């Protein structure tokens with residue numbers, strides 16, 4: 001049997017944020033069985049905690065209901081928060097297909113309430129499909145350049161001129177399905193405070209609660225386009241329109257041509273705990 | 279807090295059949311909170327066990343991740359199997375929006391391993407969109423008349439000339455999305471033994487494991503079209519192609535013009551058990 005916990009990542013209140021199921025002591029599960037369990041749970045992702053293979057604290061395998069992923073933000077944040085309940089360490093090194101990811105755990109009275117992660121440094125380029133994407137979103141233009149970032153998944157960023165304009169979007173999800181292997185992240189805000197909405201037929205998401213792997217890229221995008229500086233953190237509020245408000249904090253250090261660190265942090269909270277029969 | 283169990287309905291082996299989450303002692307949860315919990319779990323349905331209002335044993339509310347349903351087969355079967363663990367009664371009367379549904383519980387050494395339910399008696403008519411539906415499915419013709427049945431949901435039946443032809447279907451799911459408020463059930467077989475596959479963009483299902491509300495209608499369809507008699511049970515195997523084999527048993531008593539009972543039964547098994555923090 002296996003114990004699991006359901007963590008709402010990028011939230012401090014249950015039923016907010018973005019859920020992940022975390023399965024402990026998973027070394028006896030073949031990968032095909034992990035995939036079947038992730039399909040059974042049908043959450044955005046289920047993760048599985050394994051013994052480390054390269055000097056980290058644990059190896060984490062990440063599964064959507066259909067495929068394994070090499071890296072994902074909210075699932076790894078939730079995993080760090082869940083595992084932090086079972087260690088006294090101030091930081092946790094979680095091995096993934098993309099390498100060993102460092103977390104810094106934040107506790108109050110032994111309970112891990114938040115964590116910060118160092119993400120893969122993304123690459124980026126112009127999407128080059130602006131008219132098609134804007135038509136699918138139902139708008140005439142973006143504020144800032146429409147660029148697509150890669151850090152495992154791919155994330156496109158489209159800027160809106162106000163938070164009210166962001167909330168008013170009603171995208172044509174059929175038209176968005178022509179955008180393969182990417183998520184579409186629409187954003188608005190100013191200064192330290194930004195709002196986002198994410199849509200991705202390709203990744204099986206009508207509209208996402210908290211797209212943690214997009215938070216780092218968004219900080220880079222805002223710094224490149226002069227809205228913040230490199231080294232300054234932003235607070236990104238996502239998921240409001242779908243009733244799953246999520247707070248992601250992100251910072252990118254260095255300069256566009258020589259990024260040295262991309263950090264993303266958030267709260268997490270336990271929604272439930274249980275045991276499965278295999 | 280609330281306890282829940284995950285039941286794989288229409289299966290005797292975990293990771294087969296069709297999952298449902300069953301939440302006990304739910305009288306303190308407002309319906310908006312039940313809906314939020316069902317969205318959090320993201321299973322096909324979550325059900326909530328409430329005190330009865332009309333002389334049954336319990337009132338069951340059924341939620342998909344997006345809406346409440348008045349009746350659903352696999353969720354109610356799983357609920358009866360989960361609740362049967364907490365009573366000695368041979369049968370359970372579960373109240374729903376469609377009325378009080380009688381279950382007969384089947385136990386071995388106190389464990390409920392199967393149950394049989396009496397479903398709402400369906401109505402039916404010709405679909406009248408045959409060429410469109412056949413094109414969406416990728417085939418030229420049906421064996422038996424293409425008719426749509428209503429017992430809460432709506433289920434269309436398209437017959438294939440062999441089990442191998444059924445397994446070979448690769449429907450155009452975009453074309454199927456033009457069929458609103460219905461599921462498309464394709465079937466093949468002979469005698470007592472039938473195979474089914476179900477597809478429903480309208481109900482949020484690419485391909486379903488076990489469509490319990492379609493089993494009763496299928497028995498009626500086979501009897502009307504001379505493949506079985508009224509009063510004879512069939513075994514329907516669904517979900518093979520997607521790795522979630524499910525066995526549903528169904529029987530319709532009476533005659534087409536005067537149906538007296540529609541019974542559907544299946545095994546169920548616990549996949550997991552847990553507790554949520556609200």
Ligand SMILES: Nc1c(C(=O)O)cccc1[N+](=O)[O-]
Nearest residue numbers: 069070071072151152153203
């Ligand atoms: N994390 C992802 C996702 C996702 O988050 O849905 C999708 C495709 C690829 C990756 N990746 O390569 O890491």
Ligand SMILES: Nc1c(C(=O)O)cccc1[N+](=O)[O-]
Nearest residue numbers: 347348349350429430431481
């Ligand atoms: N059970 C359903 C479903 C479903 O099973 O997805 C969908 C629409 C309506 C009903 N209904 O009215 O009972």
